Amino acid sequence: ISGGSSISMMYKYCSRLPHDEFFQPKPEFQFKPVDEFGGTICRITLPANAPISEIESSLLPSTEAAKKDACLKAVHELHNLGVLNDFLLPDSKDEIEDELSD
């Protein structure tokens, strides 16, 4: 699987993180630490300005990764729909490196 540019789009979603200086106020991030019996639970919730994007479910034993899941799944949930693309930065903001993003 040779990806890159596709990430720039997926990473952008993660870029919504707080630690991110380029992250705008609107998105939300929440991590739920659980036993290895269910890795970690990633809880993401977007503003009313956004329809879907929420992703709650474990998959990774790590928060950073667990979040990546919901974050990744969130992108898809937004990609599959993408009805508020007007609320989110278009490809214009996607004009960045795959690594740069997120």
From Swiss-Prot:
It comes from the Eukaryota. Residues 6-98 form the Dicer dsRNA-binding fold domain. It is found in: Nucleus. Coiled coil: none annotated. Ribonuclease (RNase) III involved in RNA-mediated post-transcriptional gene silencing (PTGS). Functions in the biogenesis of trans-acting small interfering RNAs (ta-siRNAs, derived from the TAS1, TAS2 or TAS3 endogenous transcripts) by cleaving small dsRNAs into 21-24 nucleotide ta-siRNAs. Functions with the dsRNA-binding protein DRB4 in ta-siRNAs processing. Acts in the RDR6/SGS3/DCL4/AGO7 ta-siRNA pathway involved in leaf developmental timing. Plays a role in transitive silencing of transgenes by processing secondary siRNAs. Belongs to the helicase family. Dicer subfamily. Interacts with DRB4. This is Dicer-like protein 4. The chain holds residues 651 to 752 of 1702 of the full protein.
